[PDB]
C-alpha cells in the first residue's frame, strides 16, 4: 500500500525562457504581448480624426484652392498628414516657424475659422487681381483663400493701417505674409511704390518685414516667393498692420479650442470607418495585453510599447512527460 506526492502534467506545448535555459515547456503560460492591429485609422472614442489626405497643414490653414475639403473642419481627435502631401504652398515660398505651429496644433482639438477682415473692406486697394497660375482653381488663376494678395489700385498703393481686436474668449491664430518679387519692374507693376514693408505689432509682437526683390528658379512656374507668418492674439489684445506694399493680408483667422490632447500622426492610410480606444499610424489596437509591439507613436489608452517579438510569462510548472 502506497501514497505518493506528485505534480501536474498536460499536453501543453507552450514555452517560456529563463536566464539558464530557453524554451522550457510549461503546463500553463500567459502571453502578455499584443502583436496585432486592424490596419485602419479609426475614430478615437467616437471622435473622428482630421485626415488631411493630399493637403499639408499649411495648405489647409492658408487655404490652398486644392484643399477646399478643409475650409471649415469640425472638432477632431487626432490629425493625420502624409509624409509628403502634394498640396501645400501652391505659390512657392516659406512658412516661418512652421514646425512650432504644427506642434501647437498637436495640443488642440479644434480651430474654428472666423472672418476678421472682410475682403470687401479694401476700398483703396485691388482685392481681386491677386491671383496666380501657381494656385489654379476650376481652370483659372486663384490663390490661398484665407489671405488676400493686395494689388495697387488706380496706379497707387496708399499706406495700409489696420487694426483688429480679439473680442473672443479664445486665443486667435492669425496668418499673413509678404511677397518677394523677382525684380524691381515687378515691384512697380504690382505695388507702385518701390520701397515697402509690412509691420506688425501686438502687446508682445514687434515685427517689420521688407521684400527681398530677387530672381530665383521657377517652382510651380513662379520665380517669386511668398513668406508667411503667424502669431497668437490673446483675448482682448489687438494686432496692428501697416504696409505700403507686398502685404498678403489676413481675411480669416482661427479661434483655438484647447480641449487639448491631440497628435499629428504621419500615415498614408485614409479613414477606416471604425472606432477604437487606441490608435497607431499603422492601425488600431483593441486589447487587454499590457504590452504591444505595433508602433511607438500611439494615441489614446494603450498597452506599453516595447520592441519585443515575444513576451510570455510562465504561470504553471515545467511540463514533464
Amino acid at each position: 500500500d502506497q501514497i505518493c506526492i506528485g505534480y501536474h502534467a498536460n499536453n501543453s506545448t507552450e514555452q517560456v525562457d529563463t536566464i539558464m535555459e530557453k524554451n522550457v515547456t510549461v503546463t500553463h503560460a500567459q502571453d502578455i504581448l499584443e502583436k496585432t492591429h486592424n490596419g485602419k485609422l479609426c475614430d478615437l472614442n467616437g471622435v473622428k480624426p482630421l485626415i488631411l489626405r493630399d493637403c499639408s497643414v499649411a495648405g489647409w490653414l492658408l487655404g490652398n484652392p486644392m484643399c477646399d475639403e478643409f475650409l471649415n473642419v469640425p472638432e477632431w481627435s487626432y490629425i493625420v498628414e502624409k509624409d509628403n502631401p502634394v498640396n501645400g504652398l501652391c505659390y512657392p515660398e516659406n512658412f516661418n516657424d512652421y514646425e512650432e505651429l504644427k506642434h501647437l496644433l498637436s495640443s488642440t482639438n479644434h480651430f474654428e475659422k472666423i472672418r476678421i477682415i472682410p475682403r470687401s473692406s479694401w476700398s483703396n486697394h485691388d482685392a481681386s487681381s491677386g491671383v496666380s497660375s501657381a494656385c489654379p482653381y476650376n481652370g483659372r488663376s486663384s490663390f490661398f483663400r484665407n489671405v488676400v494678395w493686395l494689388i495697387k489700385k488706380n496706379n497707387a498703393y496708399p499706406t495700409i493701417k489696420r487694426s483688429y481686436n480679439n473680442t473672443n474668449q479664445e486665443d486667435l491664430l492669425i496668418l499673413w505674409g509678404i511677397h518677394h518679387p523677382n525684380d524691381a519692374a515687378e515691384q512697380t507693376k504690382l505695388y507702385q511704390n518701390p520701397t515697402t514693408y509690412v509691420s506688425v505689432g501686438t502687446s508682445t509682437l514687434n515685427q517689420r518685414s521688407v521684400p527681398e526683390i530677387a530672381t530665383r528658379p521657377k517652382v510651380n512656374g513662379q520665380s517669386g516667393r511668398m513668406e508667411f507668418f503667424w502669431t497668437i492674439l490673446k483675448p482682448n489684445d489687438a494686432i496692428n498692420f501697416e504696409s505700403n506694399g507686398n502685404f498678403i493680408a489676413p481675411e480669416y483667422a482661427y479661434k483655438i479650442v484647447k480641449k487639448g490632447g491631440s497628435a499629428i500622426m504621419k500615415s498614408g492610410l485614409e479613414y477606416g470607418n471604425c472606432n477604437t480606444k487606441c490608435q497607431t499610424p499603422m492601425g488600431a489596437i483593441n486589447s487587454s495585453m499590457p504590452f504591444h509591439n505595433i508602433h511607438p507613436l500611439t494615441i489614446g489608452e494603450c498597452p506599453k510599447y516595447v520592441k519585443s517579438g515575444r513576451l510570455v510569462l510562465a504561470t504553471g510548472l515545467r511540463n514533464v512527460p
Binding site: 505534480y7 499590457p290 515545467r318
Partner: protein
C-alpha cells in the same frame, strides 16, 4: 530544479491529475487514484496571480513617445530627440524582457519548492509508519485504506 523535486527525485508529472498542480496518488486494497492538494495548489495560484499583476502594474509608467517635426537646419536637435525616444524604448524593452526572464526562473523554482515542501510535510507525518521509496512515494508497513489515505491528505493523520 533548484529544490530537486520536479524533474528530480520525482522524475515525471502526472497527466492523470487534472484537479491541480500538486497532489497525491494512493494505492491500497480498495483501489487507487489521483487527488490534487487544493491547499498548496490554491496557495500557488494566489502567488502567481499577484506576481503577474505586480509585473503589469510596475510597467505602467514606461516612456511614451511624442511626434515632433524638425526642419533641414534642425538636424542636431532632431537626432537628439530621436536618440532620446529610442533610448527610453530600449530601456523599457530591456526592463520588460529581463523582468520576465528573471521571474520565469523564480516561478519554476517556486513550483519546485511547493512540491518539495508538500513531500516533506507528508514525510514528517508518516514518521515511522511508512517506508520512503525515494521516488516521491511512501509504502506503508501495515496496510492502509481509503479512510487511512484520506487521513494523510486530511492533514489530520496522527496516531493520536
Amino acid at each position: 530544479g533548484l529544490f530537486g523535486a520536479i524533474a528530480g527525485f520525482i522524475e515525471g508529472g502526472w497527466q492523470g491529475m487534472v484537479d491541480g498542480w500538486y497532489g497525491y496518488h494512493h494505492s491500497n486494497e480498495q483501489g487507487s487514484g489521483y487527488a490534487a492538494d487544493k491547499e498548496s495548489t490554491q496557495k500557488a495560484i494566489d502567488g502567481t496571480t499577484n506576481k503577474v499583476n505586480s509585473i503589469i502594474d510596475k510597467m505602467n509608467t514606461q516612456f511614451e513617445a511624442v511626434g515632433k517635426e524638425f526642419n533641414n537646419l534642425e538636424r542636431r536637435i532632431e537626432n537628439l530627440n530621436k536618440k532620446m525616444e529610442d533610448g527610453f524604448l530600449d530601456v523599457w524593452t530591456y526592463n520588460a524582457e529581463l523582468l520576465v526572464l528573471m521571474e520565469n526562473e523564480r516561478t519554476l523554482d517556486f513550483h519546485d519548492s511547493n512540491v518539495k515542501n508538500l513531500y516533506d510535510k507528508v514525510r514528517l507525518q508518516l514518521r515511522d509508519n511508512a517506508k520512503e521509496l525515494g521516488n516521491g512515494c511512501f509504502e506503508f508497513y501495515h496496510k492502509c485504506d481509503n479512510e487511512c489515505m484520506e487521513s494523510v491528505k486530511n492533514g489530520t493523520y496522527d496516531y493520536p
